């Protein structure tokens, strides 16, 4: 007669049970390896390059299989910065990079821009116009190759 | 019989050529085990186990060095703490 946990109706509306692969949440005697403040079992990872782990990653409840902090996605390659351009998708944003291009013949500059598709973890809530830091990862979709690592307000 | 020689029972064919001594042709025996090859087979198993024995000795030396280094730190800590 062991009373287990209950289904979290907030985060279970996807026709299949959302669960973290790295850990088993049905353990009667959890160890000290992966335990958050609430005493639950949650897998969290420490990425490199001196990036702090968000609080919602350590003591949250969301399930993301493409998050760089709570999944097997690793960060390697390039680190860039941009401004949020659109947040009309689900866990995806568009960032824009603006720069000046120098034309040698006329000795003058030229305004140019480029658009990138980035995966936004639920640990972050960026608004349009904010500045973000993104890091390169493996192909996560047809167009996505970067992951959000930090957000600067306004 | 299992011990009787077989080199003397091989079939020999005779070829005659005009103005030449007749020659006898016999097949070369295959799968014939000689005391030269019996020592060759048994030799292989000798250094197969010898090589494995050597690696176990190399493992023991490493564990001695690891443990002895770990032991010296305990004595140094206790020597200073007691004295």
């Amino acid at each position: 007669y062991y009373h287990a946990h209950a289904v979290d109706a907030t985060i279970q509306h996807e026709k299949a049970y959302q669960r973290q692969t790295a850990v088993n949440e049905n353990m009667h005697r959890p160890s000290r390896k992966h335990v958050n403040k609430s005493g639950h079992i949650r897998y969290s990872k420490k990425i490199g390059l001196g990036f702090k782990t968000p609080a919602k990653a350590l003591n949250g409840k969301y399930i993301d299989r493409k998050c760089p902090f709570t999944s097997n996605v690793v960060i390697r390659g390039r680190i860039l910065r941009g401004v949020v351009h659109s947040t009309k998708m689900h866990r995806t944003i568009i960032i824009r990079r603006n720069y000046l291009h120098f034309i040698k013949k006329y000795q003058r500059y030229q305004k140019r821009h480029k658009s990138l598709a980035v995966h936004c973890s639920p640990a972050f809530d960026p608004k349009q116009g904010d500045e973000v830091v993104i890091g390169q990862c493996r192909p996560l979709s047809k167009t996505i190759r970067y992951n959000v690592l930090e957000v600067v307000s306004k | 019989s299992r011990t009787e020689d077989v080199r003397k029972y091989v079939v020999r064919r005779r070829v005659v050529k005009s103005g030449k001594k007749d020659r006898l042709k016999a097949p070369k025996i295959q799968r014939l085990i000689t005391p030269r090859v019996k020592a060759r087979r048994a030799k292989k198993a000798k250094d197969a186990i010898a090589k494995v024995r050597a690696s176990a000795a190399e493992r023991r030396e490493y564990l001695r060095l690891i443990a002895s280094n770990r032991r010296a730190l305990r004595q140094r800590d206790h020597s200073k703490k007691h004295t």
């Binding site: 490199g48 | 493992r59 490493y62 280094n69």
Partner: protein, 260 residues
Amino acid sequence: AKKHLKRLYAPKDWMLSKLTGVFAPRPRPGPHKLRECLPLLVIIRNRLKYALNAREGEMILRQGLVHVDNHPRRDGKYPAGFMDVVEIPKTGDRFRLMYDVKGRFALVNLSEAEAQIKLMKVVNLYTATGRVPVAVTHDGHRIRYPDPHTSIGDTIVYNVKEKKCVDLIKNRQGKAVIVTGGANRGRIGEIVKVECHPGAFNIAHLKDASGAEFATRAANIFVIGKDLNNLQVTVPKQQGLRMNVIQEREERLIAAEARK
């Protein structure tokens, strides 16, 4: 896939004339990289001048008359490289492959009890089956039980004749190194301070014997001794001392004037 090598595409460290032929011998995979190796056919024929052509160079090699690291090699495409010992017992000459101050390959004469050891840089460490530690060196060797204090970047003194490691040199502040790549190849310096940039390359600052200051990537340095006084390996004549081109041009003009 590829099997040939055009002469123009061959590395410039070798001395091959563009007007002599279309092709150059392509080294086989082995201990050293293709772009940082000297094939055995080039050493025998183009440097030692023992073989006039490549037909006579095959007679010498396929007889096993050339020993590399105390082992005969009969392939003219064998990739011999840095810190390698080449011995020909019939002629009684022993060499070591090093870099001169300019950057070219140099053959340094050796003696007995010195042609028995070589220095290897550790590039990787991992755990094998049965929980044994294995270290991979810069020339493909795999040591199955290294010193417990070994780390990546250190130098291991090996004994080719008897096949066990004898000593270990650690990589840190206050040590003698030789640069093996870049624009400062073959220069012997002294580690001053190393900048650590995670994810990117590390930069090491070195000072020469004369006091000249220079920098290079951390992967291009090779520890060879505690300091410039007691080196563990014989170096070429210039001792890794780079000189100005202005003065260099003057002495050769004077020496050649009095040469006759």
